[PDB]
Symmetry: D2
């Protein structure tokens, strides 16, 4: 189910859209990683996007501490299902989550076979 | 209030994001137009985006008939408030709404001073 | 340079790329208009993109006067010739040009069936 | 052509543009890696973008062998030098290259503080 290591506060969400069909990208695998002091990527949270191309409950507020996180979207598998040959191996978003900055993090990604865009909406409220 | 000519079914919605600050673009004016047979743009619906950068209730299902619609976002005013000199006069999205194709229309726009992207998510459910 | 009506130093250039195929968008029709005194769009220049997805020689520096211009890219015909039913009728770029001296404008567009991004690169001439 | 380690026919090129200023992204650090046999990223090539926001001569056609490569763009340092606190640490592009013959790869990136788009243009060489 479109959730990860924290069905609660939802301080981090991922939304994936398909720019070829103009629909959400459903069942896309997403793996979230946290950088360890030994500077390697330790698995953190993961899941498959829902029917609306969203993924929530990846983490919890108490678990989501300041650090460097990497969100990796398996775009290649998604396009392969569609019978379309892609260019990227996957799409990744590497960022520093800080405490002073706003609360919630929505990472959106818009996919095309040879292109992808990603934006971050950082705010304080709900949705 | 972030609504237009139809606080009901919500067959058409507009979401605007600011890629410079990573927040929704609030209070952006949007004017929706419908093409008349005399092929001119007749005003249709309009509004200002909410705190979450969204605009709903622009129209109603019975009003939203097949045709060519133009969504015009006043990006220039938005950037001027921010004290940033923009390039575009505004951003526009011209499209043909058909009945066989999926139900709801979400038009999203991501703004930067010298660039803008727009995508359409056409589906059948809710959100 | 090549004055009168041709690329003196090519003050206006358009570059179009196909995001589904990883290639330049070839043979795309482009129409440029200029806001006329009476507040209407007068035909200014037109062309088709080359093998490199580019269009040069649309105007000259002497004719490219201060004004509001609209670059219209026939995205629809392009996608249709490919067997794809796009979402937008066209992509339009509206901007004020040369209001504080002659500049060189490169308008780029990245195309996907349900999405397009546009970017402007403005350069202050010399030789 | 210029073999050994230089742009024989420039099989790999990177182009970076600034979406906030309408200009090429100058002096941006770029690091290319290649997936090593042991499944780790080995340093392949590096450079900084020129005045045109471009980077050529990163490799040669004889050395640019079949493999999985990662183009890392130091977006963070760029935005910071400008007095802007960006969201991402960098922008990364991961792809398989030359698996069915040598191709020419142009990797473009459009940068905004909280957003970036990336596009690949693949060409089949000749002369």
């Amino acid at each position: 189910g479109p959730t990860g290591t924290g069905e609660s506060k939802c301080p981090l969400m991922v939304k994936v859209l398909d720019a070829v069909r103009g629909s959400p990208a459903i069942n896309v695998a997403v793996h979230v990683f946290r950088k360890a002091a030994d500077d390697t990527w330790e698995p953190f949270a993961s899941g498959k996007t829902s029917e609306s191309g969203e993924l929530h409950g990846l983490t919890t507020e108490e678990e989501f501490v300041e650090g460097i996180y990497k969100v990796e979207i398996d775009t290649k598998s998604y396009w392969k299902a569609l019978g379309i040959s892609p260019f990227h191996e996957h799409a990744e978003v590497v960022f520093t989550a800080n405490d002073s900055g706003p609360r919630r993090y929505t990472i959106a990604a818009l996919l095309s076979p040879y292109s992808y865009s990603t934006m971050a909406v950082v705010t304080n409220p709900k949705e």
